[PDB]
mmCIF file of C-alpha atoms and ligand atoms in Angstrom:
data_model
loop_
_atom_site.group_PDB
_atom_site.id
_atom_site.type_symbol
_atom_site.label_atom_id
_atom_site.label_comp_id
_atom_site.label_asym_id
_atom_site.label_seq_id
_atom_site.Cartn_x
_atom_site.Cartn_y
_atom_site.Cartn_z
ATOM 1 C CA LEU P 1 6.170 -187.423 -90.659
ATOM 2 C CA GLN P 2 5.143 -188.913 -87.308
ATOM 3 C CA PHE P 3 3.695 -185.564 -86.026
ATOM 4 C CA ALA P 4 2.400 -182.401 -87.577
ATOM 5 C CA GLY P 5 0.650 -179.761 -85.463
ATOM 6 C CA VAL P 6 -0.022 -176.176 -84.635
ATOM 7 C CA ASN P 7 0.578 -174.015 -81.580
ATOM 8 C CA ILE P 8 -2.677 -172.928 -80.032
ATOM 9 C CA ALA P 9 -1.653 -169.720 -78.227
ATOM 10 C CA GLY P 10 -3.288 -167.525 -75.630
ATOM 11 C CA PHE P 11 -2.377 -168.753 -72.120
ATOM 12 C CA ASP P 12 1.104 -167.467 -72.914
ATOM 13 C CA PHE P 13 0.022 -163.900 -73.430
ATOM 14 C CA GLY P 14 1.856 -161.358 -71.344
ATOM 15 C CA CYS P 15 4.691 -163.810 -71.026
ATOM 16 C CA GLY P 16 7.874 -161.914 -71.662
ATOM 17 C CA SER P 17 11.119 -163.248 -73.012
ATOM 18 C CA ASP P 18 12.563 -162.535 -69.508
ATOM 19 C CA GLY P 19 10.325 -165.105 -67.684
ATOM 20 C CA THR P 20 7.867 -162.503 -66.322
ATOM 21 C CA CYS P 21 4.267 -163.606 -66.950
ATOM 22 C CA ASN P 22 1.863 -160.799 -66.182
ATOM 23 C CA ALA P 23 -0.609 -163.611 -65.163
ATOM 24 C CA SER P 24 -3.440 -161.095 -65.543
ATOM 25 C CA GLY P 25 -2.702 -160.998 -69.329
ATOM 26 C CA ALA P 26 -3.309 -164.745 -69.787
ATOM 27 C CA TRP P 27 -6.107 -165.288 -72.306
ATOM 28 C CA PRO P 28 -7.436 -168.787 -72.837
ATOM 29 C CA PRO P 29 -8.228 -169.608 -76.481
ATOM 30 C CA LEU P 30 -11.542 -171.279 -75.698
ATOM 31 C CA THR P 31 -15.084 -170.171 -76.333
ATOM 32 C CA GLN P 32 -16.047 -169.844 -72.577
ATOM 33 C CA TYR P 33 -13.237 -167.875 -71.020
ATOM 34 C CA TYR P 34 -14.226 -165.398 -73.791
ATOM 35 C CA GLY P 35 -11.535 -166.284 -76.339
ATOM 36 C CA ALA P 36 -11.486 -167.995 -79.763
ATOM 37 C CA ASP P 37 -12.885 -171.486 -80.508
ATOM 38 C CA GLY P 38 -9.589 -173.300 -79.874
ATOM 39 C CA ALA P 39 -11.471 -176.574 -79.523
ATOM 40 C CA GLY P 40 -13.108 -176.089 -82.943
ATOM 41 C CA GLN P 41 -9.813 -174.951 -84.417
ATOM 42 C CA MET P 42 -8.480 -178.359 -83.304
ATOM 43 C CA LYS P 43 -11.493 -180.395 -84.554
ATOM 44 C CA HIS P 44 -10.804 -178.788 -87.895
ATOM 45 C CA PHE P 45 -7.057 -179.093 -87.934
ATOM 46 C CA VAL P 46 -7.448 -182.855 -87.371
ATOM 47 C CA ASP P 47 -10.571 -183.728 -89.337
ATOM 48 C CA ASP P 48 -9.875 -181.690 -92.464
ATOM 49 C CA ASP P 49 -6.097 -181.061 -92.494
ATOM 50 C CA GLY P 50 -4.491 -184.177 -91.027
ATOM 51 C CA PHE P 51 -2.848 -182.530 -88.039
ATOM 52 C CA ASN P 52 -1.903 -184.748 -85.240
ATOM 53 C CA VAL P 53 -0.611 -182.868 -82.229
ATOM 54 C CA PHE P 54 -1.129 -179.397 -80.702
ATOM 55 C CA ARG P 55 1.157 -177.335 -78.653
ATOM 56 C CA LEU P 56 -0.410 -175.485 -75.755
ATOM 57 C CA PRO P 57 1.741 -172.693 -74.343
ATOM 58 C CA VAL P 58 1.243 -171.711 -70.727
ATOM 59 C CA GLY P 59 3.247 -169.821 -68.108
ATOM 60 C CA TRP P 60 4.566 -171.044 -64.775
ATOM 61 C CA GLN P 61 2.991 -168.098 -63.060
ATOM 62 C CA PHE P 62 -0.415 -168.989 -64.407
ATOM 63 C CA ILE P 63 -0.086 -172.597 -63.306
ATOM 64 C CA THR P 64 0.819 -171.635 -59.784
ATOM 65 C CA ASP P 65 -0.690 -168.115 -59.524
ATOM 66 C CA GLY P 66 2.562 -166.211 -59.224
ATOM 67 C CA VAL P 67 4.823 -168.677 -57.356
ATOM 68 C CA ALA P 68 8.065 -170.505 -58.426
ATOM 69 C CA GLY P 69 7.239 -173.975 -57.159
ATOM 70 C CA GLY P 70 4.822 -176.741 -57.990
ATOM 71 C CA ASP P 71 1.713 -175.850 -56.003
ATOM 72 C CA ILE P 72 -0.782 -175.900 -58.842
ATOM 73 C CA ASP P 73 -3.544 -173.339 -58.559
ATOM 74 C CA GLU P 74 -6.802 -175.232 -59.159
ATOM 75 C CA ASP P 75 -8.948 -172.535 -60.775
ATOM 76 C CA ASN P 76 -6.239 -171.633 -63.288
ATOM 77 C CA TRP P 77 -5.474 -175.280 -63.918
ATOM 78 C CA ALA P 78 -9.142 -175.991 -64.575
ATOM 79 C CA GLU P 79 -8.976 -173.457 -67.407
ATOM 80 C CA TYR P 80 -5.801 -174.923 -68.848
ATOM 81 C CA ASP P 81 -6.879 -178.509 -68.537
ATOM 82 C CA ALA P 82 -10.049 -177.662 -70.577
ATOM 83 C CA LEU P 83 -7.832 -176.780 -73.469
ATOM 84 C CA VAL P 84 -5.807 -179.984 -73.073
ATOM 85 C CA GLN P 85 -9.092 -181.920 -72.890
ATOM 86 C CA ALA P 86 -10.171 -180.269 -76.130
ATOM 87 C CA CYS P 87 -6.907 -181.240 -77.726
ATOM 88 C CA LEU P 88 -7.367 -184.840 -76.690
ATOM 89 C CA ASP P 89 -11.065 -184.840 -77.598
ATOM 90 C CA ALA P 90 -10.090 -183.725 -81.100
ATOM 91 C CA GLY P 91 -8.106 -187.010 -81.465
ATOM 92 C CA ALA P 92 -4.565 -185.601 -81.248
ATOM 93 C CA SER P 93 -1.470 -185.644 -79.013
ATOM 94 C CA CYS P 94 -0.836 -182.543 -76.813
ATOM 95 C CA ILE P 95 2.396 -180.814 -75.854
ATOM 96 C CA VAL P 96 2.144 -179.139 -72.458
ATOM 97 C CA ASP P 97 4.684 -176.327 -73.007
ATOM 98 C CA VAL P 98 5.877 -174.233 -70.051
ATOM 99 C CA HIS P 99 6.496 -170.959 -71.857
ATOM 100 C CA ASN P 100 9.100 -169.299 -69.661
ATOM 101 C CA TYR P 101 12.423 -168.892 -71.562
ATOM 102 C CA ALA P 102 14.179 -170.740 -68.730
ATOM 103 C CA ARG P 103 13.380 -167.817 -66.456
ATOM 104 C CA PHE P 104 11.089 -166.670 -63.657
ATOM 105 C CA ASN P 105 10.731 -162.903 -63.322
ATOM 106 C CA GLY P 106 14.083 -161.850 -64.785
ATOM 107 C CA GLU P 107 16.059 -164.614 -63.148
ATOM 108 C CA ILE P 108 17.374 -167.960 -64.566
ATOM 109 C CA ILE P 109 16.434 -171.394 -63.263
ATOM 110 C CA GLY P 110 19.411 -173.169 -61.771
ATOM 111 C CA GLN P 111 21.610 -170.122 -62.373
ATOM 112 C CA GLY P 112 20.393 -167.097 -60.356
ATOM 113 C CA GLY P 113 16.631 -167.798 -60.363
ATOM 114 C CA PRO P 114 14.559 -170.664 -58.960
ATOM 115 C CA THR P 115 16.443 -173.803 -58.112
ATOM 116 C CA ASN P 116 16.358 -177.009 -59.991
ATOM 117 C CA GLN P 117 14.111 -178.265 -57.161
ATOM 118 C CA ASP P 118 11.605 -175.390 -57.300
ATOM 119 C CA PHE P 119 11.415 -176.282 -61.011
ATOM 120 C CA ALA P 120 11.347 -180.062 -60.603
ATOM 121 C CA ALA P 121 8.470 -179.738 -58.202
ATOM 122 C CA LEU P 122 6.514 -177.992 -60.941
ATOM 123 C CA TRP P 123 6.965 -180.803 -63.339
ATOM 124 C CA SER P 124 6.176 -183.444 -60.755
ATOM 125 C CA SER P 125 2.773 -181.865 -60.306
ATOM 126 C CA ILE P 126 2.116 -181.407 -64.015
ATOM 127 C CA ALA P 127 3.180 -184.983 -64.646
ATOM 128 C CA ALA P 128 0.964 -186.292 -61.811
ATOM 129 C CA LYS P 129 -2.022 -184.860 -63.650
ATOM 130 C CA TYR P 130 -1.614 -186.676 -66.972
ATOM 131 C CA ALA P 131 0.775 -189.543 -65.890
ATOM 132 C CA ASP P 132 -1.295 -192.447 -67.268
ATOM 133 C CA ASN P 133 -2.239 -190.540 -70.464
ATOM 134 C CA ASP P 134 0.224 -191.450 -73.243
ATOM 135 C CA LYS P 135 -1.031 -188.828 -75.732
ATOM 136 C CA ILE P 136 0.633 -186.128 -73.597
ATOM 137 C CA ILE P 137 4.124 -184.812 -74.426
ATOM 138 C CA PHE P 138 5.879 -182.744 -71.816
ATOM 139 C CA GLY P 139 7.687 -179.695 -73.143
ATOM 140 C CA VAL P 140 10.144 -178.937 -70.370
ATOM 141 C CA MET P 141 10.853 -175.363 -71.299
ATOM 142 C CA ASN P 142 10.212 -172.988 -74.118
ATOM 143 C CA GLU P 143 13.105 -171.188 -75.830
ATOM 144 C CA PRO P 144 15.972 -170.912 -73.374
ATOM 145 C CA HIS P 145 18.215 -168.090 -74.456
ATOM 146 C CA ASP P 146 21.271 -166.188 -73.260
ATOM 147 C CA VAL P 147 21.983 -168.854 -70.629
ATOM 148 C CA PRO P 148 25.552 -168.662 -69.378
ATOM 149 C CA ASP P 149 26.277 -172.389 -68.646
ATOM 150 C CA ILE P 150 24.567 -174.998 -70.735
ATOM 151 C CA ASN P 151 25.648 -177.987 -68.649
ATOM 152 C CA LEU P 152 23.965 -176.528 -65.582
ATOM 153 C CA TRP P 153 20.911 -176.069 -67.759
ATOM 154 C CA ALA P 154 21.090 -179.682 -68.871
ATOM 155 C CA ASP P 155 21.206 -180.458 -65.081
ATOM 156 C CA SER P 156 18.005 -178.485 -64.542
ATOM 157 C CA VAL P 157 16.405 -180.487 -67.334
ATOM 158 C CA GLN P 158 17.565 -183.723 -65.774
ATOM 159 C CA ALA P 159 15.881 -182.673 -62.634
ATOM 160 C CA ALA P 160 12.567 -182.170 -64.481
ATOM 161 C CA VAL P 161 12.836 -185.448 -66.362
ATOM 162 C CA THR P 162 13.453 -187.329 -63.168
ATOM 163 C CA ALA P 163 10.538 -185.536 -61.549
ATOM 164 C CA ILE P 164 8.354 -186.469 -64.531
ATOM 165 C CA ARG P 165 9.165 -190.196 -64.549
ATOM 166 C CA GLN P 166 8.775 -190.467 -60.795
ATOM 167 C CA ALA P 167 5.247 -189.146 -60.947
ATOM 168 C CA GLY P 168 4.468 -192.143 -63.173
ATOM 169 C CA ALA P 169 4.854 -190.524 -66.586
ATOM 170 C CA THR P 170 6.811 -193.425 -67.871
ATOM 171 C CA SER P 171 5.445 -193.727 -71.417
ATOM 172 C CA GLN P 172 5.591 -190.122 -72.683
ATOM 173 C CA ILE P 173 7.980 -188.151 -74.805
ATOM 174 C CA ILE P 174 9.809 -185.367 -73.073
ATOM 175 C CA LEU P 175 11.208 -182.523 -75.174
ATOM 176 C CA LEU P 176 14.612 -181.194 -74.264
ATOM 177 C CA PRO P 177 15.410 -177.582 -75.077
ATOM 178 C CA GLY P 178 18.754 -175.852 -75.343
ATOM 179 C CA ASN P 179 20.176 -172.403 -75.834
ATOM 180 C CA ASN P 180 19.840 -169.595 -78.362
ATOM 181 C CA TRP P 181 16.041 -169.852 -78.295
ATOM 182 C CA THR P 182 16.646 -173.540 -79.149
ATOM 183 C CA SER P 183 17.609 -172.385 -82.567
ATOM 184 C CA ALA P 184 18.082 -175.513 -84.696
ATOM 185 C CA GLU P 185 21.023 -173.817 -86.430
ATOM 186 C CA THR P 186 23.210 -173.569 -83.321
ATOM 187 C CA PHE P 187 21.832 -176.545 -81.432
ATOM 188 C CA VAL P 188 25.003 -178.618 -81.952
ATOM 189 C CA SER P 189 27.559 -175.834 -82.423
ATOM 190 C CA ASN P 190 26.877 -174.102 -79.056
ATOM 191 C CA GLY P 191 27.003 -177.232 -76.964
ATOM 192 C CA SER P 192 23.312 -177.667 -76.439
ATOM 193 C CA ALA P 193 23.331 -181.140 -78.013
ATOM 194 C CA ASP P 194 26.349 -182.622 -76.228
ATOM 195 C CA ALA P 195 25.184 -181.360 -72.824
ATOM 196 C CA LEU P 196 21.663 -182.576 -73.375
ATOM 197 C CA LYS P 197 22.838 -185.877 -74.805
ATOM 198 C CA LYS P 198 23.799 -186.772 -71.161
ATOM 199 C CA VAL P 199 20.237 -186.492 -69.874
ATOM 200 C CA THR P 200 18.700 -189.847 -69.131
ATOM 201 C CA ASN P 201 15.614 -191.468 -67.595
ATOM 202 C CA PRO P 202 16.028 -193.037 -64.142
ATOM 203 C CA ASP P 203 16.912 -196.489 -65.583
ATOM 204 C CA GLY P 204 19.824 -195.055 -67.704
ATOM 205 C CA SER P 205 18.066 -194.962 -71.120
ATOM 206 C CA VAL P 206 17.360 -192.050 -73.521
ATOM 207 C CA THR P 207 14.162 -193.715 -74.746
ATOM 208 C CA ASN P 208 11.588 -191.056 -75.506
ATOM 209 C CA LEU P 209 13.760 -188.038 -74.789
ATOM 210 C CA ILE P 210 13.643 -185.935 -77.889
ATOM 211 C CA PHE P 211 15.429 -182.688 -78.554
ATOM 212 C CA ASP P 212 13.209 -179.647 -78.849
ATOM 213 C CA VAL P 213 14.117 -177.181 -81.555
ATOM 214 C CA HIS P 214 12.688 -174.064 -83.144
ATOM 215 C CA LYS P 215 13.391 -172.370 -86.530
ATOM 216 C CA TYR P 216 11.835 -169.475 -88.439
ATOM 217 C CA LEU P 217 12.319 -168.483 -92.067
ATOM 218 C CA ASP P 218 13.226 -164.782 -91.812
ATOM 219 C CA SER P 219 16.690 -163.232 -92.040
ATOM 220 C CA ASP P 220 17.179 -162.813 -88.269
ATOM 221 C CA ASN P 221 15.434 -166.069 -87.110
ATOM 222 C CA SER P 222 12.944 -163.909 -85.132
ATOM 223 C CA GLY P 223 9.652 -164.841 -86.769
ATOM 224 C CA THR P 224 8.652 -161.184 -86.765
ATOM 225 C CA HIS P 225 8.858 -160.626 -90.525
ATOM 226 C CA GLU P 226 6.183 -161.423 -93.040
ATOM 227 C CA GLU P 227 8.639 -162.232 -95.810
ATOM 228 C CA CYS P 228 10.793 -165.336 -95.982
ATOM 229 C CA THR P 229 14.333 -165.609 -97.200
ATOM 230 C CA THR P 230 15.362 -169.262 -96.710
ATOM 231 C CA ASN P 231 14.390 -172.889 -95.965
ATOM 232 C CA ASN P 232 17.049 -173.577 -93.322
ATOM 233 C CA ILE P 233 18.170 -176.831 -94.955
ATOM 234 C CA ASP P 234 21.772 -175.853 -95.719
ATOM 235 C CA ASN P 235 22.500 -174.112 -92.396
ATOM 236 C CA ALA P 236 20.183 -175.971 -90.006
ATOM 237 C CA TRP P 237 18.306 -179.147 -90.916
ATOM 238 C CA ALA P 238 21.075 -180.831 -92.920
ATOM 239 C CA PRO P 239 23.863 -180.445 -90.297
ATOM 240 C CA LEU P 240 21.393 -181.213 -87.636
ATOM 241 C CA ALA P 241 20.250 -184.535 -89.159
ATOM 242 C CA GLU P 242 23.825 -185.659 -89.781
ATOM 243 C CA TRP P 243 24.555 -185.091 -86.128
ATOM 244 C CA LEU P 244 21.263 -186.622 -85.000
ATOM 245 C CA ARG P 245 21.700 -189.753 -87.105
ATOM 246 C CA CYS P 246 25.124 -190.878 -86.116
ATOM 247 C CA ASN P 247 24.196 -190.320 -82.424
ATOM 248 C CA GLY P 248 20.976 -192.377 -82.616
ATOM 249 C CA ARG P 249 18.868 -189.533 -81.381
ATOM 250 C CA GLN P 250 15.832 -187.609 -82.570
ATOM 251 C CA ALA P 251 14.582 -184.019 -82.571
ATOM 252 C CA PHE P 252 11.174 -182.327 -82.793
ATOM 253 C CA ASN P 253 10.561 -178.923 -84.318
ATOM 254 C CA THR P 254 8.000 -177.400 -81.979
ATOM 255 C CA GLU P 255 7.967 -173.882 -83.411
ATOM 256 C CA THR P 256 8.171 -172.631 -87.005
ATOM 257 C CA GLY P 257 6.290 -170.537 -89.515
ATOM 258 C CA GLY P 258 5.987 -167.566 -91.756
ATOM 259 C CA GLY P 259 3.798 -164.986 -93.383
ATOM 260 C CA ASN P 260 0.871 -165.773 -95.556
ATOM 261 C CA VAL P 261 2.713 -164.747 -98.754
ATOM 262 C CA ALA P 262 4.402 -166.173 -101.905
ATOM 263 C CA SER P 263 8.043 -166.244 -100.714
ATOM 264 C CA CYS P 264 7.083 -168.195 -97.684
ATOM 265 C CA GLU P 265 4.894 -170.752 -99.484
ATOM 266 C CA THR P 266 7.814 -171.657 -101.681
ATOM 267 C CA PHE P 267 10.425 -171.732 -98.883
ATOM 268 C CA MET P 268 8.274 -173.449 -96.228
ATOM 269 C CA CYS P 269 7.218 -176.245 -98.586
ATOM 270 C CA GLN P 270 10.883 -176.837 -99.213
ATOM 271 C CA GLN P 271 11.615 -177.114 -95.443
ATOM 272 C CA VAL P 272 8.651 -179.459 -94.876
ATOM 273 C CA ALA P 273 9.553 -181.653 -97.857
ATOM 274 C CA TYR P 274 13.086 -182.012 -96.405
ATOM 275 C CA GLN P 275 11.777 -182.691 -92.916
ATOM 276 C CA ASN P 276 9.579 -185.560 -94.220
ATOM 277 C CA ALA P 277 12.494 -186.965 -96.175
ATOM 278 C CA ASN P 278 14.351 -187.194 -92.836
ATOM 279 C CA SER P 279 11.527 -188.715 -90.826
ATOM 280 C CA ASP P 280 14.042 -191.070 -89.097
ATOM 281 C CA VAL P 281 15.699 -188.191 -87.171
ATOM 282 C CA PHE P 282 12.869 -185.575 -87.107
ATOM 283 C CA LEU P 283 9.611 -186.516 -85.343
ATOM 284 C CA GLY P 284 7.682 -183.521 -86.790
ATOM 285 C CA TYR P 285 6.987 -179.794 -87.111
ATOM 286 C CA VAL P 286 4.464 -177.631 -85.242
ATOM 287 C CA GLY P 287 3.488 -174.341 -86.805
ATOM 288 C CA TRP P 288 3.555 -171.163 -84.796
ATOM 289 C CA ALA P 289 0.465 -169.489 -84.259
ATOM 290 C CA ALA P 290 -3.198 -170.188 -84.129
ATOM 291 C CA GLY P 291 -5.465 -169.955 -81.072
ATOM 292 C CA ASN P 292 -6.344 -166.362 -80.394
ATOM 293 C CA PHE P 293 -4.132 -164.208 -82.438
ATOM 294 C CA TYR P 294 -6.030 -161.541 -84.415
ATOM 295 C CA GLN P 295 -6.293 -161.981 -88.182
ATOM 296 C CA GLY P 296 -3.572 -159.500 -89.158
ATOM 297 C CA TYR P 297 -0.998 -161.260 -87.061
ATOM 298 C CA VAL P 298 2.094 -161.599 -89.150
ATOM 299 C CA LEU P 299 2.596 -165.366 -88.490
ATOM 300 C CA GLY P 300 -1.087 -166.121 -88.363
ATOM 301 C CA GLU P 301 -2.518 -169.583 -88.834
ATOM 302 C CA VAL P 302 -5.989 -169.057 -87.328
ATOM 303 C CA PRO P 303 -8.652 -170.526 -89.564
ATOM 304 C CA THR P 304 -12.130 -169.068 -90.011
ATOM 305 C CA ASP P 305 -15.507 -170.643 -89.049
ATOM 306 C CA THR P 306 -18.433 -169.834 -91.325
ATOM 307 C CA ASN P 307 -21.445 -171.664 -89.955
ATOM 308 C CA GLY P 308 -19.492 -174.928 -89.701
ATOM 309 C CA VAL P 309 -17.212 -174.367 -92.731
ATOM 310 C CA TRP P 310 -13.590 -173.672 -91.811
ATOM 311 C CA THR P 311 -11.063 -171.941 -94.028
ATOM 312 C CA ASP P 312 -7.334 -171.925 -93.475
ATOM 313 C CA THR P 313 -4.742 -169.275 -93.862
ATOM 314 C CA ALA P 314 -2.744 -169.407 -97.057
ATOM 315 C CA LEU P 315 0.355 -170.994 -95.514
ATOM 316 C CA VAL P 316 -1.445 -173.756 -93.746
ATOM 317 C CA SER P 317 -3.319 -174.825 -96.891
ATOM 318 C CA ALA P 318 -0.445 -174.323 -99.335
ATOM 319 C CA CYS P 319 2.272 -175.878 -97.153
ATOM 320 C CA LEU P 320 1.892 -176.916 -93.518
ATOM 321 C CA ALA P 321 -1.142 -179.191 -93.630
ATOM 322 C CA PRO P 322 -0.225 -182.847 -94.000
ATOM 323 C CA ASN P 323 -3.328 -183.111 -96.263
ATOM 324 C CA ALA P 324 -1.649 -181.139 -99.085
HETATM 325 O O1 LIG Z 1 13.513 -167.097 -82.906
HETATM 326 C C1 LIG Z 1 12.532 -167.426 -81.916
HETATM 327 C C2 LIG Z 1 12.298 -166.275 -80.940
HETATM 328 O O2 LIG Z 1 13.299 -165.299 -81.277
HETATM 329 C C3 LIG Z 1 13.272 -164.027 -80.617
HETATM 330 O O3 LIG Z 1 14.151 -163.140 -81.342
HETATM 331 C C4 LIG Z 1 15.586 -163.273 -81.212
HETATM 332 C C5 LIG Z 1 16.119 -164.280 -82.257
HETATM 333 O O4 LIG Z 1 15.879 -165.642 -81.830
HETATM 334 C C6 LIG Z 1 17.620 -164.073 -82.546
HETATM 335 O O5 LIG Z 1 18.045 -164.923 -83.617
HETATM 336 C C7 LIG Z 1 17.897 -162.605 -82.887
HETATM 337 O O6 LIG Z 1 19.265 -162.410 -83.271
HETATM 338 O O7 LIG Z 1 17.604 -161.814 -81.734
HETATM 339 C C8 LIG Z 1 16.220 -161.855 -81.335
HETATM 340 C C9 LIG Z 1 16.154 -161.077 -80.023
HETATM 341 O O8 LIG Z 1 17.002 -159.934 -80.148
HETATM 342 C C10 LIG Z 1 11.841 -163.431 -80.564
HETATM 343 O O9 LIG Z 1 11.792 -162.415 -79.556
HETATM 344 C C11 LIG Z 1 10.710 -164.440 -80.265
HETATM 345 O O10 LIG Z 1 9.405 -163.937 -80.618
HETATM 346 C C12 LIG Z 1 10.855 -165.738 -81.040
HETATM 347 O O11 LIG Z 1 9.810 -166.622 -80.565
#
């Protein structure tokens, strides 16, 4: 109810689930840079649909041109900032999502891979850009999975948070991701919640530290199927809210979606109706996948521009748009 948005993808392309980002394969979803009209996409999603925030996936490698640290490469950053500027210019809040699966080329941050410091550095720099700007929302890490020790991971996340506040980003939300691809279904049961509950700002508060969760509507939670089989209320959003409420904490669903078909319009509308009903514990949903996915993409949300007139995919206009 506070936020509803869509992921504008492209800078994440050739990012693998193992933290390897073929930083050649990055493809900015902006007219210029020879990609789709991501800016226009966002004008439309706000002005006509009532969307509010956009999530802008990008890889560590792109930000730094291949290095695990925080030395931001200016030419690449110029590209990525233009998208963030388009998101802000559209009137919305923007999640800056480092799309690395808690890894850097095969190896896990804090646990085999780059150190918590290598990582913290990164976020200091990102935060230093953008510190004053309160419409930014820092997404620490996208979809950690098969991590062996969650408390060490929560330590890595502490390190980022602390980096972020110390660069002056005092007013922003920071999203905190846990294990199993931050599945919302296992977020409490696997220890992600209790570990991440310990993460605090420098002054000792949890103000503006929101859990980051993801949930798809297909049998295997992959978001690779067109057809949908559930609304995740019974097994995910209900238990989650109970837990979230009694602990005085909030979560944010930064990835979800489904195919542009009947079964999904019924089941997604159910999930979104429930999520609004629990607006105290859930800050919002963000739908996975506009930007520069081709039309036949199974989870597609890219609208169409006909001489100024935009047209949404089925699922956005039937279910995901606040204006419906
Ligand atoms: O679900 C989000 C994320 O999932 C990836 O697939 C996982 C899935 O999360 C898990 O439930 C299933 O059992 O295994 C697969 C991997 O084997 C998927 O690769 C991503 O595209 C997606 O963003």
